[PDB]
Design a protein around this ligand. Sequence first.
Ligand SMILES: [K+]
Ligand SMILES: [K+]
Ligand SMILES: [K+]
Ligand SMILES: [K+]
Ligand SMILES: [K+]
Ligand SMILES: [K+]
Ligand SMILES: [K+]
Ligand SMILES: [K+]
Ligand SMILES: [Zn+2]
Ligand SMILES: [Zn+2]
Ligand SMILES: [Zn+2]
Ligand SMILES: [Zn+2]
Lengths: 376, 370, 370, 376
Amino acid sequence: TRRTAFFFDELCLWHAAGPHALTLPVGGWVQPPAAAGHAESPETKRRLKSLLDVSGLTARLQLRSAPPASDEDLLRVHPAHYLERFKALSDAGGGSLGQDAPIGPGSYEIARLSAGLAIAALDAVLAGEADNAYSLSRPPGAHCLPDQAMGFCFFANIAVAIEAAKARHGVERVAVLDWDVHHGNGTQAIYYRRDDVLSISLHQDGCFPPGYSGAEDIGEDRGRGFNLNVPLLPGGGHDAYMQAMQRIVLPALERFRPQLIVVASGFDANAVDPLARMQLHSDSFRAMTAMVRDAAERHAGGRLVVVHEGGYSEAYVPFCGLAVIEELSGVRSAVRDPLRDFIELQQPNAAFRDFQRQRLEELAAQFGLCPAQPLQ
Amino acid sequence: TRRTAFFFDELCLWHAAGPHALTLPVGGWVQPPAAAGHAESPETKRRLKSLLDVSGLTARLQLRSAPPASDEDLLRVHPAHYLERFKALSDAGGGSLGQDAPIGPGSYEIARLSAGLAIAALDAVLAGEADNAYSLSRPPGAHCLPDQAMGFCFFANIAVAIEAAKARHGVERVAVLDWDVHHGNGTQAIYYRRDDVLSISLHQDGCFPPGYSGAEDIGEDRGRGFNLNVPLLPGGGHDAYMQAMQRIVLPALERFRPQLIVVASGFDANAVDPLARMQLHSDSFRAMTAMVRDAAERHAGGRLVVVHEGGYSEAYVPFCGLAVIEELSGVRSAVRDPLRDFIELQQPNAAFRDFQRQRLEELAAQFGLC
Amino acid sequence: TRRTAFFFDELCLWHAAGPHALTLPVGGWVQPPAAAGHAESPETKRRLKSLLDVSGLTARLQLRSAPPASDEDLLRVHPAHYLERFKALSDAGGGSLGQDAPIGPGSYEIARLSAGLAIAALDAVLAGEADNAYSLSRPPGAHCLPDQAMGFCFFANIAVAIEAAKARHGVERVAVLDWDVHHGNGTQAIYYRRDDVLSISLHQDGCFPPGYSGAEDIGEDRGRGFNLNVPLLPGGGHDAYMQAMQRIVLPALERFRPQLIVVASGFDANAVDPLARMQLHSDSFRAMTAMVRDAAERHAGGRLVVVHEGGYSEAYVPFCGLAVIEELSGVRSAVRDPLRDFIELQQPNAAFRDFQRQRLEELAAQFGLC
Amino acid sequence: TRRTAFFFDELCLWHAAGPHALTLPVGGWVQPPAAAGHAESPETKRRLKSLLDVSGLTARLQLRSAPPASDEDLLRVHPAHYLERFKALSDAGGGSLGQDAPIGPGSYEIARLSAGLAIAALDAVLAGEADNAYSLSRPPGAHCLPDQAMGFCFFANIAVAIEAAKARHGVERVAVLDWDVHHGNGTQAIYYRRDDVLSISLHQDGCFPPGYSGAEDIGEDRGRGFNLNVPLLPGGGHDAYMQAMQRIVLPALERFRPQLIVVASGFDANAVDPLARMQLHSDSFRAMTAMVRDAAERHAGGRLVVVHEGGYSEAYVPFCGLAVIEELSGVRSAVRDPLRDFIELQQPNAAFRDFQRQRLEELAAQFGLCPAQPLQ
Ligand SMILES: [K+]
Ligand SMILES: [K+]
Ligand SMILES: [K+]
Ligand SMILES: [K+]
Ligand SMILES: [K+]
Ligand SMILES: [K+]
Ligand SMILES: [K+]
Ligand SMILES: [K+]
Ligand SMILES: [Zn+2]
Ligand SMILES: [Zn+2]
Ligand SMILES: [Zn+2]
Ligand SMILES: [Zn+2]
């Protein structure tokens, strides 16, 4: 039961930046790595695909690709001079497109494809071709501004897909929940004065962009109350995210009445990610997906699209991504998470949990969110 | 410009486990990595050495190697059957020597060399051949128990070094400060009932061994009050460690009056390490080294040895290790940490810092350090 | 546009040996690689599959998997104690199953799957489910003897496939053409005294097994004249292989009238392979496949199965394997081989070509093919 | 006995091109590699250094670095606009400097250092600071033209070093023996009309540059008879090289009377190299080094410099490089070549050897070389 579309294309795994040691450009005092290049490597997303295959999950999904984003679709958010600058740099072996936004040769075409998968996933779910969808969109989108590449993002994938969906289906209320561990600054900025898109970011306080918390950035004018930042304390794990979901996200969704929920799903909150300091395990991602699927079922006829964003642990992202897809599809594979029990033991102690919970209660009050129970 | 001995052997970088994805052994659901093997890779330690060379710092250090640890030295802490067991598995091409303790072909002889470098570094500093020393001892030592390999450690390098030092030189009070992000359980266990060795561990609360905090474990009988665990909240960074150093570590060292300070220096509290959740930058490790070098100058005649332990960020461990060595030597290279400013902006907010600070005040009071 | 079945299982790409530098086991003087492990890596086979997907060719093929080979199937060629021995070493985390035959954790079950894909590919073609087939059977099979793993091969995939086919379908004459650059010693040995299987090996003279040429080894008793070795001079390329195909292989197949042709298709004769010294490009493999598909259409009702064997250039095997599959399917993708023109310019000069040609004329005459 | 200078700098191992699969630029149909990048990787040269260290050889050599090449030194062969174009591309994250000549960020400074090590090695040997020298000059030099980067080479290291040595010491007769498996086209072109430099290339017929043999290219006018190409048949190994050394190289050296011998020492003729089809083992390189050391001792007061060029087998180049340095230093380590015996068995058969030998006899006759025996 439940029909889940899995939007995937092998060519998304061929995007590759020049030499980097994690996030640091090679050059100067940064030695080229012998093996592992840029943090946003193909391997993180590849290993997820490979585990879906060997576990039997891929066979139970509707595996689909899609055409690349048209220039028309891209131009709804990005200017033509940005497209031209990107293509030119892409045609000259790659280089630096923005702040922490290195591209490689042919990255332009691959970024168009990534955007296209997101466009197509929202389309398929709005058209009723599937109940929900997972789009393995690499390179990612959540940090990209209209006029500026950043945080490994070159097009604003989700915003492009939403604008295309509005043009084609006339959906009026879309909620974007971004549980990537970093702040979804691209989605926030694009929809900041808009009430047709509710953007919620759970992120590690001050991680990326560095030093940004944003609790008081709730949107402006027409968009006031339709952006919500939940800056979680570094070191939090399962309980911190469960409390955020229950006290902030679910109430915010209840009030907004989404016709479609899009999840910007990074897995970089996992307990072994190099690019954040949070302590999630695969069952945390499973539980967040269960809660958002339920919200989608109550508000949006089940219409839910999960778009892959970050996740930089080659070893562990596969197990987290697999838990999300199992929950979307309602299929339980024989896969057992070999780090689950270990990560359980590393969780914050009761005093730390109490401290974070109290902050979240205060934040819910500050946002004016009523603690109601779910209903039809 | 002090005299710093740098103990290093290229062959320590040749120890390699079987296929792993981070800490997970390949097999079952864990696919073999296309490139990046076990977390405890040669590359983290090699890249420190490479940056030490390209910066020119190596030319300002006293470069040394050492013989492998003798059976005599190893046998002060490990039984003969452990050595036998280890060697057999090593000669057979490797495998699992214990819990999270995989070994590869020849890992036995390489582990003996790692231990030997630790032995030699303490010796050189105690003999007056250098003011202080850094030992690039891979594989690491601080989790290894007398008859149980664990946490990627196969001999208890520091314990072996200390027992060897005591036999040869007759040093009476040694302080071991372990700022590796994980609990120094091996050092703690070996010296738990002893007052001639003060063991202090700074670690992420519950990280490794998983779920272990340990604030209440202060030693027993003769050792009571000569073990200190400071379980820091996950997510803490520079201020949390500076507060732990000022409130607990330095007062503890003052009270103990060590004649030698050994640091179990893991860099895995760095802000981009996969194996912990702490937020240190290179200047944090610089600052901790300055604080401990000062304690060593006050009580130990400058006698400080830093033994390299963990650190699993290939990109960032080199900058942190270099900061330590710059501080030990008193030489500042041209190297500039390209992540430092970024990491400063990611630090805990004031409320989180205050929360951790109050916790450290209470722990300092529990330890009788007020 | 013919009907081509592509047998593939992602799990075949999860077999991985312990640490090796190319073919050398790590240990002693061979330092662990910073990234690039054993020559028989997942990446060569994975990159073929990735290019098949990005080219869109996969959408024009009949994609299939298979059950692992049963004990019954394996036991037609291998003894139970071999299976036991293999499994024990696999469950223990791997090691050396034979001479140049390292295995990793779970390699036993993965080798059974590799064999299963070969069994299924022959079955599908014999049952009329496809006109022809390609099996991405990793680990490979052509060097494995009944009770001796060697040359990175742990079961004799093709022999197991053939024996299974004979039991189920009752095919009487099978031709095995092995254009892997190394000698197909396992296939040769198993069928040496048999006339129901014609084994032909094209290989680099003396490459692997090292020093073996074998022109004189034509089979014995009932098998006499049903084994042909063509030991090509190292350094030969396209013309050497085209001459071997026209003068020896095609006449041999004509004489034998196979009812099924199986190709042991290694790509290790490619011009940038580390494990041989030959100079083939993707159009050479395209041409050899066209020639054998034609022989199969003439005698075997089109029944041709290509089993993937060697190929150790990550960069270039994908283009060569794609050319084969394009030829089998009759579909031409948009893919253009970026090394082809370069390799054409590197070919043997006319004097070297003439030298090799005269050698092949004489060998053809020795074989009674004039 | 014998004092061997080993010119090395760790920073030479930090030169790294953008993503390549062997020699193929990533992009289009060439997928980015998961691990191993460009063929000219740091690892080949690093593993040689590591083996020198663990074997005890490094401790028995005079380990030295040197300043980078000055613009003055570079300008003796390269134009200022070439230096400027290189630096600009190097400062912008790298890219393509020529045909099969990709550079990375900071490659300019590292290439200057590589040239500087070569300059310094010739200087040290001409000054009598050591009997002979080995320079681990990465990136390599032998393919670089004055006006054009190629074959992974960005400065003409050996030519730069020779021109500097002539300016500083006034050496009049330098022989460059290039046993890298590819044609030393840079050295050939620069000295093609010169009789003060004898350039000899042993190379696989038609390998790199592709299709070039060059037996009839013997130099012109003043340089006629002071360039010699020995195009060996692909597939040849130990005997083919021994015959070439005995029938061509030694006689050519005898006639020329070098005051200094420089060896452009690539190890890409090794039996497992991806970038050529030849079958040398470490004892082949040992024997070639012994013969050239002897020639240097008879003609040049022992003055011999070996400059690292190619070699693309991570596994095997270390054992070959180690054999050369053992022979230069006269120190025999405990290292045993684990592929030696295997490669012995793969050698060409007697008919193939006879075919190549006869070609070499005919070539010696064509060059007008008399088969004399060595003497003082
Ligand atoms: K977020
Ligand atoms: K909004
Ligand atoms: K610690
Ligand atoms: K104690
Ligand atoms: K063959
Ligand atoms: K036969
Ligand atoms: K040459
Ligand atoms: K000349
Ligand atoms: Zn992220
Ligand atoms: Zn640690
Ligand atoms: Zn082969
Ligand atoms: Zn070369």
